[PDB]
Structure formats: structure tokens, C-alpha cells
Design a protein around this ligand. Structure first.
Ligand SMILES: [Cl-]
Ligand SMILES: [Mg+2]
Ligand SMILES: [Mg+2]
Ligand SMILES: [Mg+2]
Ligand SMILES: [Mg+2]
Lengths: 393, 397
């Protein structure tokens, strides 16, 4: 199990993905997602120039030692580029270990805790009516849970995000959003009733007392979660929200370390932690985050956008299958070309994922095919207030 | 004036440096340090592929807007690669602003608060005796303050004892014993005080190797020697790690060279768990961000102690000396001399005299880069070491 080769693959079958592959002397290989949307080449360089050369000759079986070696050894700790590189290595090594054990990853983690993995779909429209049409469409596809978003009247742009080479510039009004958003949830409940799980993503745009107000306003509609209410580098930002509303709260897709959320969890300021495998240091780190969360009744809600590759999604479905405190798994379907580049054995049926049974995380990469889709630069948008203030997107 | 061009320069005049240069439509230019030791090319790519293209055509004068645009706009916030890229842009833009104002940077910041900037030098040796020899040598050069490190008997390799840490292509592997270090370290400080007396400022870098209660013990043990600071006692991603140390010793504490965000140290500062904040301009988001960190620190009597190793370029050092000259709550400035080749690649107007830095008077931060000279020294990979315990446990270096 000594590592004989390690290298990145960069491909764009609909959007950019970076993948790390590790091959052992025996021939067993593993892959890990290394995709960091809008900053992809920073991780590619971090891996190619600084991590990959140190992997050669290491015992691929020493997952924990390698994690600590890269985490502590980098000297400069944490961060999106850093932890994504570490996650890619970690995910490839767990893939290798599961293959060596002859087991699908969920078995190696402690076995199945559930028979299937509940997902939610994105439902978006310009008007509230447009959004309701999308909800109906997804309910018919078997989704038990939908995230709803609609345009704000008076505002040209509200939350494939990486649509432009350079960042697109959106304009935002908090006050108009706060008055309009509760109407969307009222309308969803009027048309679809109470059994549907309804989620909403605030996408970082509020202050705490504004989020508190929104949380209260939407209590009658019993949302599954209100996500990313406020920027949370200062974790105390959640406190006012939690003290003022019983609407459940989700946060953390932009986090990369347990140290970004330890206090959020221990103070019981959130209900769902959203940090995913690719950005949160892989299986090794996320097991620890999920276990900490479990002590405080917090459940997992992994970020699952198109900009995490099928490698992440497969591993996430395995993790979701084992973890006791599973909440929900986001599903944004990849393109057919992306699915072809990353063959996999996870299945989607009746609104749920089912883990694969192949040894490993069940995902591979077709390198020859990946090479036919060259990288194309694409950046995430930015958001400005009406006066031009650079805001949170 | 809009940005016409922006690009990185990577050079290795003794060790690796990455620099960002921004050029305006009028031809005026500014530079910023982008060097992240042992991970240099991650920052180069972050800048080259993702930041530089977004700078073209921007108003160079909009420093704050650019900082927020890069920080918030990245979506993934904070981190060493991220914040070093942002710092490089920020430093180059302040360089340009000061040149436009026709003033040295310290004047732009609020003017001078001091007539000179106290430094400390690194004194190191295998034995305590070897270290003392180095102290004597630096005292002779005019240093008022010294950091002292020496070998631990029974341990082959320890931090700060040979010094250029990134001295191998792949990470060197060192071995460590906490218990041997804890019993030996106080003997070094006792010896320094015996030979050199009480007026000298004496610093020591623990370099992340202790647990909180071990650092508490060390702090107490070294109280009689009145250290200027005991630095980086424990890894501090969990900021509460400092609490037991602070509750058990009056030895002053310094932390933060591995930090990149005010959010890495807000609680350390507000709870009064440290005396000096060490996060430097290059890794801490530049002048824009570090002004904010220093100001928060000032409310709690915390002083600046910018990390100043060889792996921050003369661009950072010059900007740091300007910052140090203005900031009210200045503590000390680390000085690790750069190589001749490095100083030639980065011509500068800061000066070192009688143990102190003096800020330049040229408009800008006073540092430039000679691109033709830089081109003579190609990048050469070098990684920081890792540290293992005697049983093989991957530890903190
Ligand atoms: Cl980073
Ligand atoms: Mg979201
Ligand atoms: Mg109360
Ligand atoms: Mg240090
Ligand atoms: Mg007490």
C-alpha cells in the first residue's frame, strides 16, 4: 500500500472539477475531490507543487498520520485552499482503504444506520408563481423536500452560480427581501400543504437582528431550515437569531474546520451543520465534526451543489448512510457529461440516494475522457447594495 | 487612475519570494509581498488565475472596496493562501496611494508615533554556552533585545537551532520530547540573566509544542527571568487554549504568526489572554486588515509584535517598518537579516541602526523590485520541517 503515484486531474465537463488520484505499488487506486469553486487552480497548485511530492512512498494505510502530517505540517493551518487539498488526499485514502478491505465505504465507517438518504431539490423562479411551478415539478419527481427561492420585486438579481469568467455583479436590497420572503413560504404552504419539507437559503445577506426578524416571521410556515442567515466568521453572530426565533437554523457550507463551528455547536446556536467533505478536510475531519454535533442534537446537512464533484457526492452518500445524526443531503444533479467523466454506483430513486455496494466510495474517473474537457475560468458573483457597497453574495 | 496591469514575480535569491506588482494607466506602480513559506505556488496560482484578471480596469485608489471585493467575493473566506493573496494586493495598493500622495507610508497612516523601531535578533546555539556567545555578539551590534534558543540534551533537533527552517525539498523530520525541553529551558534563561544582567530584553519561542498546562508550568518556571515574551506556547485554533496559561503565570505571552484573520484572535485579545499579537502584514490581509487588528488590540493593552522571518520579503519588512512607526501600540519588530542577493533584488530605503529600524522617507512603502535581477534566481522548492514525538506521533513543529 505504499504510494507510487499521486497527481491531479483538472476537467470541465459542464463546469470545473479538480480531482486527486493516488495509486499504490500494488495497483489499487483512490480518488478525492479537490474542487474549490472560483479558486480551483489555487488548490491544484497547492496539491501539485507542495503535497503530491510528499505523498510518494508514504504508506497509504496511514490515513490519520497523513491527515495530521498535512494539517499540522503545512504550518499555516486551516483555510479553504488548505483544507480542500487535505480533503482530497483524505478522500482518496479512504477510497483505497475501503477497496483494500473489500467493503463499500459505509461499511468501513461503522455500517448502515438507514436504508436510504433523503435529499432536497432546488426550486427557483422569478416570481412566487414561477417558484411554485418548480415545486410542483420536483414533488412529482419524488422529492420530499424542496429549497425555495424567488425574485424580490424591485430588485433585478437575487440568489450555475459561476456563470461568468469575471465575477458577475448583482444588486441587493435587504429591506425589500425581508418584506417579500415570508410571502413565498405562505404561498408554498397554501398550495402544497404541511407535509412537504421546505428549506430556504438566506445566503449571508442579513445582520443578526434582521435574521431574527425573518426567523420569527416564518415560524408559521415551519421551515426545515433557514440557512446561512449571516456571515459567521464571528460565531457569536448566531446568538441573537437563536434567542429570538424557533425556526431551525443551518450554517456552514463556507466553513473548512471544526474550529469554524465548535462554539456554534456547543452553544446550541444551529440545528444543521452544512460543511461538506471536499471543503471540510474529508472523512477524517467530518466524522469529528458530526460527532461533536451529535452531542448537541445538531444534524448533518452536507452542502451538495454541482461544484462538488460526483467523487464528493459518492463519499457523502456513504457517510450519510452511516452517520447517526444525519439530517438531509442536498441534491443538485450533475450534467450527463460530468456523470460520464465520473462513473459511480450511487443511485437516486424516489427522492432519495442509495449508497453503492462496490468497494471504495464507488466513484472513479475516466482520465481519457476528462482530458477532452479543458479547464475554463469561471468566477462566483459578487453582490453590491444599491449605493454600491460591496456586500455578501 | 485604473489598473492597467498586474502580475506576480517569483524569485529565489537565497530563498523563495512571491511578489505582486500592480501598474496603473499612468505608469505608477506598487508592489506587495505574497510569500507563504513552503506553500508559495498556491498563492502564486491564487493570484495569477483568480485575482489578477479581476484587478484589470479597477480603480487603484479604491483600496477598501478592493479588499472587501476580494475577501467577501472569494466566497470562501479567510485562510493562509486567501489572505496572503489579499495582503499582496492591499500592500501594492497602499504603495500606490502613498506614491500618489507624495508621502512615505507612515505619513499616510497618521504620521510617526516614535523616532525609531526597536528590534530583536535571533541568538541560537547547540549548548547554552553556544547561545550565550551569540547573545554577546548581538549585544555588541546594538540589539536591545534577543530571542534565545538552545539545544535540549537528549534531543537531536529542536526549534531555532541549526538558520533557514525550509532547508529541504521535502519536509525534514525532527524528533521531540516535551518533558526534556521543560526541564532544560529555564536553565537557558537563568544563564542569560547571569551573564548579561537585567536590562536586556529576552524573548523565547516555544513553537507550538506544549499543552496549556505544560505552558503554564513553563511560564511560572521562567517568571524570575522576566522574559519580554513567551511565544506560541500552544496551538491556538481553539483560542481558549490560552486560558490556563494566562490564569497561572505572569510571564508575558505572544501569539499569532500562523494567523491570517482578526477572527483567529478576537477572543484572545478581548479576554486579555495575550500581550503581543504576532500576525504580520503579508499573512494577515495587509495594512487594511492589520490596522483593525492593532486597534482592537490597543483596547486591551495588547501590543504589536509582527512576525519578521527571512520568509517575509523586504517588501513586507519596509511596509511593516512604516506601520510600526505610526501604530500607537507598537511592541517590537522581529529582525532576521535577508541575504545580500535578496536585499539587491528588493532595493529599499528602510535602515537599521543601533538595534532599531528607521522608516524610509520615499513616497510609497519605500521598497521596489528589480525584475531583471529577480529573473536570475529561479524558484527552488523548499518545505518546512515536521516534528514527531519519540514514539513517532506527528506533532507540532
Ligand atoms: Cl487558504
Ligand atoms: Mg447555501
Ligand atoms: Mg435569553
Ligand atoms: Mg515564532
Ligand atoms: Mg481564576
Amino acid at each position: 500500500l505504499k504510494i507510487r503515484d499521486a497527481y491531479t486531474i483538472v476537467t470541465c465537463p459542464g463546469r470545473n472539477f479538480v480531482t486527486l488520484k493516488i495509486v499504490t505499488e500494488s495497483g489499487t487506486h483512490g480518488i478525492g475531490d479537490a474542487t474549490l469553486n472560483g479558486r480551483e487552480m489555487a488548490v491544484a497548485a497547492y496539491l501539485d507543487e507542495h503535497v503530491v511530492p510528499a505523498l510518494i512512498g508514504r504508506d497509504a494505510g496511514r490515513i490519520e498520520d497523513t491527515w495530521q502530517y498535512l494539517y499540522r505540517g503545512a504550518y499555516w493551518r486551516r483555510g479553504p485552499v488548505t483544507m480542500t487539498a487535505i480533503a482530497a488526499v483524505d478522500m482518496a485514502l479512504w477510497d483505497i482503504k475501503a477497496k483494500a478491505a473489500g467493503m463499500p465505504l459505509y461499511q468501513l465507517l461503522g455500517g448502515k444506520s438507514r436504508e436510504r438518504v433523503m435529499t432536497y431539490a432546488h426550486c427557483t423562479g422569478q416570481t412566487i408563481e414561477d417558484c411554485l411551478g418548480e415545486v410542483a415539478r420536483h414533488v412529482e419527481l419524488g422529492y420530499r423536500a424542496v429549497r425555495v427561492q424567488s425574485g424580490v420585486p424591485g430588485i433585478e438579481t437575487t440568489y450555475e452560480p459561476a456563470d461568468s469568467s469575471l465575477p458577475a455583479e448583482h444588486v441587493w436590497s435587504t429591506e425589500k427581501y425581508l418584506n417579500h420572503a415570508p410571502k413565498l413560504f405562505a404561498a408554498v404552504r397554501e398550495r402544497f400543504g404541511d407535509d412537504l419539507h421546505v428549506l430556504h437559503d438566506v445566503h449571508h445577506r442579513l445582520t443578526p437582528i434582521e435574521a431574527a426578524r425573518l426567523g420569527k416571521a416564518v415560524e408559521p410556515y415551519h421551515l426545515f431550515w433557514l440557512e446561512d442567515c449571516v456571515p459567521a466568521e464571528n460565531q457569536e453572530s448566531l446568538r441573537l437569531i437563536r434567542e429570538h426565533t424557533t425556526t431551525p437554523l443551518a450554517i456552514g457550507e463556507v466553513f473548512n474546520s471544526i474550529h469554524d463551528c465548535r462554539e456554534l455547536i456547543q452553544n446550541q446556536w444551529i440545528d444543521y451543520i452544512r460543511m461538506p467533505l471536499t471543503h471540510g478536510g474529508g472523512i477524517t475531519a467530518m466524522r469529528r465534526v458530526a460527532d461533536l454535533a451529535s452531542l448537541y442534537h445538531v444534524r448533518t446537512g452536507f452542502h451538495g451543489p454541482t461544484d462538488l464533484s460526483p467523487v464528493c457526492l459518492g463519499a457523502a452518500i456513504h457517510f450519510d448512510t452511516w452517520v447517526p445524526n444525519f439530517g438531509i443531503q442536498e441534491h443538485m444533479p450533475h450534467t450527463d457529461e460530468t456523470d460520464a467523466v465520473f462513473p459511480h454506483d450511487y443511485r437516486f430513486e424516489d427522492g432519495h440516494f442509495l449508497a453503492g455496494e462496490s468497494p471504495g466510495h464507488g466513484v472513479d474517473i475516466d482520465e481519457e475522457l476528462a482530458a477532452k474537457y479543458p479547464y475554463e475560468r469561471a468566477s462566483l458573483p459578487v453582490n453590491r447594495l444599491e449605493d454600491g457597497t460591496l456586500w455578501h453574495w
